[PDB]
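Quick one before lunch.
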Amino acid sequence: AKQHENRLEDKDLSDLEELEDDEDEDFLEAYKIKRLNEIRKLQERSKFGEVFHINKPEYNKEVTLASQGKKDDGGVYVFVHLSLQSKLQSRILSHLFQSAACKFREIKFVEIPANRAIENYPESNCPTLIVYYRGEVIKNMITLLELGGNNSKMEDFEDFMVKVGAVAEGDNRLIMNRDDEESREERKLHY
Amino acid sequence: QLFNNSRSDTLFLGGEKISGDDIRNQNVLATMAVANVVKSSLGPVGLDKMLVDDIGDFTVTNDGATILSLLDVQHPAGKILVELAQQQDREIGDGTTSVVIIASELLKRANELVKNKIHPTTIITGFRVALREAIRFINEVLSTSVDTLGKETLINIAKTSMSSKIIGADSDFFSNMVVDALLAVKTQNSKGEIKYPVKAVNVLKAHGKSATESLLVPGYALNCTVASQAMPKRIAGGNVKIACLDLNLQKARMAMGVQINIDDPEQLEQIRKREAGIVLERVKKIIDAGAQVVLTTKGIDDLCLKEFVEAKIMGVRRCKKEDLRRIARATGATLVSSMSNLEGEETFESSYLGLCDEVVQAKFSDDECILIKGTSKHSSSSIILRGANDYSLDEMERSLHDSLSVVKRTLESGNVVPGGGCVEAALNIYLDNFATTVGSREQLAIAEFAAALLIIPKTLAVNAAKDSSELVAKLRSYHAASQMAKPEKRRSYRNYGLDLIRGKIVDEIHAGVLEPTISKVKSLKSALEACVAILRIDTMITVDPE
Amino acid sequence: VVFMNASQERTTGRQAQISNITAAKAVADVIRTCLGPKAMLKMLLDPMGGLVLTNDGHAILREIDVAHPAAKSMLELSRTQDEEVGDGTTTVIILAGEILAQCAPYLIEKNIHPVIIIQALKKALTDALEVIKQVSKPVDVENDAAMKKLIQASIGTKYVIHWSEKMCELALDAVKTVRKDLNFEIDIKRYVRVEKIPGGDVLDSRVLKGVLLNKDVVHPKMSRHIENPRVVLLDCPLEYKKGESQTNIEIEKEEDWNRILQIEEEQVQLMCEQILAVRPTLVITEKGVSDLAQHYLLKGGCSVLRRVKKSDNNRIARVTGATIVNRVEDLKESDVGTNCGLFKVEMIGDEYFSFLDNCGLQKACTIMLRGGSKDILNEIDRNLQDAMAVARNVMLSPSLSPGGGATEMAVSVKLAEKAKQLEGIQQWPYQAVADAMECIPRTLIQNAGGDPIRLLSQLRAKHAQGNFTTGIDGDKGKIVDMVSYGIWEPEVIKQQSVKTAIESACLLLRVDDIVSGVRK
Amino acid sequence: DIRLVKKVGGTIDDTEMIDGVVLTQTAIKSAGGPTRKEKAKIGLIQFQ
Ligand SMILES: Nc1ncnc2c1ncn2[C@@H]1O[C@H](COP(=O)(O)OP(=O)(O)O)[C@@H](O)[C@H]1O
Ligand SMILES: Nc1ncnc2c1ncn2[C@@H]1O[C@H](COP(=O)(O)OP(=O)(O)O)[C@@H](O)[C@H]1O
Ligand SMILES: [Mg+2]
Ligand SMILES: [Mg+2]
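Model of the adenosine-5'-diphosphate complex:
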């Protein structure tokens, strides 16, 4: 049953063209128009793409209004970062935000100093990662010992975005699914 | 053993509590339970075993190094023997089956001394004085490495390591192979100290004719496939240049920082061209150098393959880091991580290229291997093992890998001793007279230490399915006269052991079996240090997981 | 306090060997009737659902998952025999089973050690290769009439013996095409292509020296019949290649966006103009082709075919002599293929097929097999792999031996006499090797429907007179010499059989304990 | 000032006081140019 679904489900618009000579045109082009429409929706939703270094008055808008988006429940995920330059984990998490911002343009990446965020919040507690969605806090994450701590990598951060429902599991942009071209080249030769 | 003890009676521990001689008995049965699988694998008469992973996959193994590593034991007293088998494989590389049997019997034979109200501190002291007395006796009984006009030694050393294997019958053919291999891959370091890097030779898992017709390669054999099929497979002629690169040769982006942002769209195509051109400028100068064969750690894109196919260059992708150092070391090249120099300019010099006589790609049963032979600067070697399947060759791979470690030690240290339980039986006669001299309670510790050493020649006869006491009694009779030899050679009744294929006591020097003395030294200390670790434990405290 | 998560219990002693030897006998019983010309066929139900109708030993064993680990050493022998030669796979399994079956009542009865048996098999294997060298002889390799009957030997067991006159010419022309001069025969099966076309008739076939593609031209104006085609292989896509650097162009003026799409047309225009610098007539590319690039190639008549596999491009290169070049700037007249002809696209309703034909000694071809079902196409395709597999060894070495149980009987008659001289303890297992070679002649006789007790009894007296070429016919069961009929095989098949059978017995005889539960 | 470096291997009898400062980490061996140094000047880099 899955062998028929893998022709369309496991191929993007660039990979669907492989089956142009083999499979029927009406079977293939019917799905390419569907996948082409999905690509256009992501382009319209790409309202972001760099870290929004904000300040508090604005928090009451950027962090929360955005989380409502269109309010068609067009919700928008907003990853906040209570930065603290003295901590080593904070500078690591700041690099992950800019790296993920260039890839996931639909998700908003927010950064602010932790001293300016909350009155007398413990310095030890931050680096603090908050995830808003439709005005509600989906995840109040604590320091990155859960995500490896000092040895945190880009692969661990992208895996966390899939757990909170920010990115699909089978997304082609994730490093887990984005296999290298040399990897797929060896598979075709050994097939 | 009988029943479970009371669980924390007025002690208030979350886990289990046990004490007394019950846990001391459980450690003996624990060391004997893991040692029974090692018993049948000892000596040439031992048989192999197979471990199933509950997924269909299985592997045949004789040595207890990887068997105990695969057997996941939860009792921590058995883990020390598991790590002892892995420890002995790293340093010596041979005798992993013997330390488990020796360490288990030293604890088993010492279990009788526990209930005699002999303290373990006195028992290990009697074992340790027996140890250093045994090491000096081993240092006295060792023999020189000449023995005749010719060498006549290294062929016999391989038979001891090659025994108890599937290819023990073919050891006569493989004995010349291993000695010719390690004499080719020698090196120089520390101003005159010769070294022999183990695993430097390439052990290929080939299928075909037989283990008897395994051809020894006079050079290194690289196990990798060709990139394109339209390339030349065979390259003849002398002075074939070898290029060893590691930099990234496929098309890759600019660094993280660089973001190409363009305002005048006219140069948008030009920046695309130079990114495609800057990677081909590196390939242009290699063709100017004239490297017939080039090897790369990373991939090779199709933009580079067209230049190698046109200029008849052998480009091979998907090399590994540890291999290319041996290619550059053998062929005379140097490892090139990037093309640059102290000056600001970028170029490639001909001195970085190696030299070899012939390079031929061969295929045998879906195994493409590039045969590089005739290295001018330094020789190299590789062994193409052939058998039934991959899992049978894993035993042959471990058989060859252990053979290199044994032949490594006899060249690093020329002192050797005969096999067949000779030194194990000789120490008993030496320690019995020494046990009476010391007098007090350590006599039983030294005596039972000597009785535990006899288990090595006894296990050879038990696994042979023959009468063991007659061979042990005859071996005891000859060694008993060795201490009372009455020197004036006529110092006979020494250097004898068991001959299992015929069931007689003959001279091991003429039979052609030897072993280096350093293996006996490290095995005895590592076996006794493991025995010290188990004897000194009194009570266990197992905490359940939260 | 189990002490072992992986089989704390053990099955040791002789009972483990009964399970081992009995399992080695069971794998031979399911393919005992798969030998000789009157052999039957088998069917396998894989879990994926793709059925296959097989009689070769290698296809039977590889598609059967076995839970017994000791048996799996026997399953892999046909895999080893397949990749080495590709013929004689069934004889290795039954011979290894008879060696293990004959060597069974010696540890139970005589209590002889296994390592003594290991020495006995090596001396028997040394004498087995000696007498096979004496029984073998050379023949002329260049005689095409002689090569037909040798290919017909392995074909006689399979279904296509009825078309043996066509199959010999089908395989002999193919193996000679890929053959070249330089182990003196370095040609490989990977260069030989075999395309399976359902439908047609197996009698109508021919060896076309080319590469059969399974797709249509991309544009309808292109002519499907070219007299003097010119092949040019390419790896770059005719589409616009997207840069892996990710660039953002910010457009603030107005003519920049129009100039970008004009530069896109100008790049494809300049790229197609460089293709026409050497004025080709047939272009091949392994990647996509944009519709913009199709129009500019109409003026030159450059027929393009897209999404061609990487292995097919190499096979196109060896036939036409074209060089695979990625970039379009490095096209020269030498890069353009030559000495090609008869480019024609035959219309078939299933799929479009395009032929090629010739007028750097490496060559290739494509055998177009016609049949009645996809499953029997795999049968005839595997017979082609067996048809060329028997032909390689006669070309590699000129040595050649008889078959049909005669060469195995010659080992037993010599080996029994050697045991008679052997004199000792190793002579008991040395006699088992001489008795182990009797299963093959016996198997052939049993399948044929004869009485093996009296047919083999007179065969012992016949070989005692001093002849070796006397075998057993598979149809009626005579003791006639094989010189009249012409049953001959290479020497490499029988050498690999006795070697793999002895080496497999040494692996399995030295097992005494069985354990599981590791979960690596 | 008295650092106890734990290295798995060998025996306890081989334990002895090293005259200089023993380093626990191994070399990189990415290039592998030098093998053995004599009369070397040691520097401590804190930047990257
Ligand atoms: N041919 C032989 N004759 C007598 N004893 C032997 C022979 N070969 C090996 N041994 C004995 O077997 C013991 C261990 O053999 P070893 O090669 O370490 O087995 P493994 O390879 O399984 O570890 C040695 O102490 C040696 O005395
Ligand atoms: N008509 C026949 N008469 C006598 N012997 C035959 C006949 N057909 C086949 N044989 C024998 O049976 C054997 C079958 O070989 P083949 O089918 O190619 O592989 P396998 O031996 O593995 O089945 C041949 O070696 C041949 O000697
Ligand atoms: Mg050994
Ligand atoms: Mg066959």
